[model samples]
Target: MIQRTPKIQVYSRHPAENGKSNFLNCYVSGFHPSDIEVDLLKNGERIEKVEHSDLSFSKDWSFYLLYYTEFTPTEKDEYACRVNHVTLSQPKIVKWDRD
Candidate 1:
């Protein structure tokens, strides 16, 4: 059996107003078993205040579920999405750098 690793991606839309909450999306996909663990981080520290979305199927019938979450961001701060699953020897981290 071939073990597949999940790919993690991060995205965000900037807040329209200052001091208002901005949402960050972590898109996790392409893994089997559908029970991967995900975490949102700030400057390498884990954050628990997160809203997760329901797992959805890929449109191409790839037999993998897509998972995502939303969270708030701090200005000028770095963020990352950490993913852990059976297929990996170590947790996969996706970092976001603000411009």
Candidate 2:
């Protein structure tokens, strides 16, 4: 009774709130009910967590809301999530902040 989704995509931008920053909403599809608890990382450090919304059927399926702990150019970040034993998605690179 387990399912997995493919790698999701995220983009980072300056948040409206100064210094808060923004992480582009990542939509991971094809997930079942049991799959939860998303772990986010930068380089090799475990930094953040991703929350799942309701099931997605539309094109826009929400999987995780990636955030930033530090800032950099084309921030080469990678993250992964797994349910059961299958690592659902591949490491995703958040769009490098170019501002």
Candidate 3:
């Protein structure tokens, strides 16, 4: 049986100076299996230089996993997180907008 569809979230951090730049964090969670794939997109194009990590929980009531991707951000950047999992019929995409 299928477990659940993936959830995506995007966040940004304040600049620290010295061209260190700001970073965007993409979080994908609530999936049962840990074999899922995640992609980071900038303005609708895939970004290559990304860092990712995975965490699995052993709680009896909620046995799921979380995925995270971090990438450097540019000014006025638009970002999205795409998640692909076996349990989902189609890829789940989540976008971030700042106003």
* Backbone N/Cα/C clashes per model: 0, 0, 0
lDDT of 2 by residue, 1-99 (tens): 444454454445565676564553444445444345443445545545443344444333323333233333343555422222145344443332323
**Better candidate by TM-score, 2 or 3:** 3
Model 3 residue 17 CA deviation (Å) reads: 9.7
Q: Give the CA lDDT, 0 to 100, for residue 36 in model 1.
A: 76
Model 3: ten consecutive residues of lowest lDDT: 60-69
Candidate 3: segments with Cα more than 4 A from true spot: 15-20, 60-76
Clashes of 2: 0
lDDT against the true structure, each candidate: 0.68, 0.42, 0.65
For residues 1-99, could you state the per-residue lDDT of candidate 3 as single tens digits? 446565677776555664455556666666565567777788988877775555665543233444344455656877887878887788877886552
RMSD to native for every prediction? 3.8, 6.2, 3.6
- Using lDDT as the measure, the top candidate is 1
Clashing pairs in 1: none
> Over the full model, what C-alpha lDDT does candidate 1 score relative to the true structure?
0.68
Assess every candidate by TM-score.
0.71, 0.40, 0.68
lDDT of 2 at 44: 47
User: In angstroms, how far off is 26's CA in candidate 3?
Assistant: 1.2
Q: Relative to the unseen true structure, what is the C-alpha lDDT of residue 80 in candidate 2, on a scale of 0 to 100?
A: 29
The residue-level lDDT of candidate 3 at 35 comes to: 66
